[PDB]
Every structure is written in C-alpha cells, then in structure tokens.
Amino acid sequence: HWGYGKHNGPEHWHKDFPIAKGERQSPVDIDTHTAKYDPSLKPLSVSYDQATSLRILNNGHAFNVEFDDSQDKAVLKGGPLDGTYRLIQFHFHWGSLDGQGSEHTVDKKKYAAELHLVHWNTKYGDFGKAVQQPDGLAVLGIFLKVGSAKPGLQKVVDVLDSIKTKGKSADFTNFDPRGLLPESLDYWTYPGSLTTPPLLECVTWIVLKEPISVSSEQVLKFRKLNFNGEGEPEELMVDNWRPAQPLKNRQIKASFK
Ligand SMILES: NS(=O)(=O)c1c(F)c(F)c(S(=O)(=O)CCc2ccccc2)c(NCc2ccccc2)c1F
Numbered sequence: 001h002w003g004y005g006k007h008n009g010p011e012h013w014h015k016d017f018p019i020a021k022g023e024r025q026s027p028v029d030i031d032t033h034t035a036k037y038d039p040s041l042k043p044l045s046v047s048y049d050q051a052t053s054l055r056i057l058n059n060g061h062a063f064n065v066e067f068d069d070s071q072d073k074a075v076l077k078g079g080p081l082d083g084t085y086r087l088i089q090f091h092f093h094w095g096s097l098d099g100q101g102s103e104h105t106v107d108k109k110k111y112a113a114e115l116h117l118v119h120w121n122t123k124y125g126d127f128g129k130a131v132q133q134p135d136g137l138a139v140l141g142i143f144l145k146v147g148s149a150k151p152g153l154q155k156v157v158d159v160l161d162s163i164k165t166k167g168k169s170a171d172f173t174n175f176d177p178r179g180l181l182p183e184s185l186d187y188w189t190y191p192g193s194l195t196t197p198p199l200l201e202c203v204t205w206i207v208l209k210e211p212i213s214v215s216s217e218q219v220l221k222f223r224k225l226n227f228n229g230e231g232e233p234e235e236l237m238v239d240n241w242r243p244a245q246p247l248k249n250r251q252i253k254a255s256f257k
C-alpha cells in the first residue's frame with residue numbers, strides 16, 4: 001500500500017511504520033562543512049571481482065539487480081565497518097526531472113538519481129536476520145548526474161523494457177557492478193536506516209563524494225518504467241525517493257580532507 005504518491009507517499013509512511021519518525025532515519029542532507037574528517041576511518045574495501053548477478057526485478061517501486069550471496073564473493077569491508085558485508089542487490093532512486101531524484105543531498109543539492117549497493121553483515125548469517133540488527137546492513141550510495149553516458153550501466157538500461165511493470169523479472173547474469181563505481185572512494189558515513197518501508201534502523205550508510213555521470217538517454221529509460229502491474233493504468237516510475245530526514249543526534253563523518 002505505501003508508495004510515492006499524494007495519498008501514500010513518504011509523508012504517510014509513519015501511520016504504518018511509526019519508526020519513520022525515529023531517531024536514526026535516512027536519507028539525510030550531508031552538510032559538507034559540519035561533516036568531521038575522521039582520520040581513524042579506513043579506506044573502503046570494495047571487492048566485486050567475483051560478483052554473480054542472477055536476476056533483475058521490477059518490484060513496483062524500483063528495479064533491483066540481485067546477486068547470489070550464498071558464498072563469500074562480492075564484499076564490502078573497511079571504511080567505517082567492523083566486519084564483512086556481503087553484496088545482495090543494487091537498485092536506484094530517481095526523479096521525474098534531472099533536478100531531483102537522489103535521496104541523500106549534499107549541502108541541499110539534489111542529484112538526478114542515487115544508486116544503492118546493499119550489503120549484509122555476514123555475522124548475522126543472512127539478510128533477513130541482519131535487518132533486525134543496528135549494524136546489520138552497509139549501503140553504499142553513489143550519486144548520479146546527467147552528462148556523459150556510463151558504458152557500465154548500459155546493460156542494465158537495455159534490459160528495462162523487459163521488466164516494464166511491477167512483478168516482472170528477467171535473467172541478468174554476468175553483470176559487473178565495478179562498472180558503476182566512480183574513480184574515488186572518498187566517502188561520508190553515518191548511522192541510519194532503510195529509506196523505504198519498513199524503514200528499519202539497521203544501516204551504516206557510506207555515501208561516495210564523487211558522483212558517476214550517466215547520459216540523459218540512460219536516465220530517460222529509467223523513467224519509462226511503471227509502478228503499476230501489467231494491465232493497470234500507467235503510472236510512470238519516477239520520483240521514488242524519500243526526502244531528507246532530521247539528522248537528530250548524529251554526526252556525519254568524512255573519510256577525506
Ligand atoms: N533504499 S535502501 O537501500 O535503504 C533499502 C530499503 F529502504 C529497504 F526497505 C529494503 S527492504 O528489503 O527491507 C524493502 C523493499 C525494497 C526493495 C528494493 C529496494 C528498496 C526497498 C532494502 N533491501 C533491498 C533488498 C531487496 C531484496 C533482497 C535483499 C535486499 C533496501 F536496500
């Protein structure tokens with residue numbers, strides 16, 4: 001029932017998910033001036049050489065690219081993390097226009113979209129148990145701006161016509177997520193939450209400072225997806241982002257400068 005409209009969007013979520021008004025909600029505005037450089041933070045370690053993609057899925061509010069996480073393949077560690085987090089899936093949030101789309105903002109600046117690479121803490125054994133823990137997930141957020149195409153995203157864009165509507169899926173093997181990363185791994189990090197229902201407060205957010213560039217034609221294809229299922233009135237999948245939430249009693253830390 002929740003979604004992104006006037007009647008079921010982010011401002012309504014608290015009625016079914018009271019944690020929406022909780023103490024460590026995401027996304028947030030990253031105030032670059034008050035983010036403290038933390039010389040104790042490590043370089044982030046992103047090991048995606050063995051990643052195995054399985055499927056791509058329109059789940060009715062984004063598209064997910066899913067990975068086989070049953071072995072220790074694609075892992076995120078280092079950075080602020082005390083453990084080993086395993087890649088499970090990635091997805092995006094984007095706008096109806098280039099001027100909006102991202103969930104995190106940087107000195108109130110909105111990017112055209114934001115990629116989330118979602119990983120779960122291997123000390124909890126699986127994703128479903130990890131989300132019940134305050135250090136259960138690590139989500140790597142990467143901003144998208146519109147400019148030159150990202151060659152490494154084109155395979156994703158090209159398959160979207162095949163999962164236009166909610167609940168459609170498609171085989172999606174041998175996709176290499178290393179092709180979606182920017183050159184620098186400088187990052188901001190803070191404790192936060194899933195940004196859609198159930199809004200669980202289980203996420204260490206690591207947001208890269210350097211955005212990737214995608215082309216206007218690439219992001220236009222994201223906007224041709226549908227929130228509705230096949231045979232229902234067409235509602236374009238756009239603006240599936242939650243606005244910035246109160247920082248409350250949290251410090252955003254920077255890995256750089
Ligand atoms: N935007 S996000 O990165 O914080 C996020 C959520 F907000 C979130 F609620 C979830 S969820 O699985 O608990 C609910 C549904 C969902 C699915 C895909 C994108 C956004 C929300 C995931 N988890 C992603 C996920 C999906 C399937 C299997 C494992 C992880 C998730 F990654």
Ligand SMILES: [Zn+2]
Nearest residue numbers: 091093116195
């Ligand atoms: Zn997300």
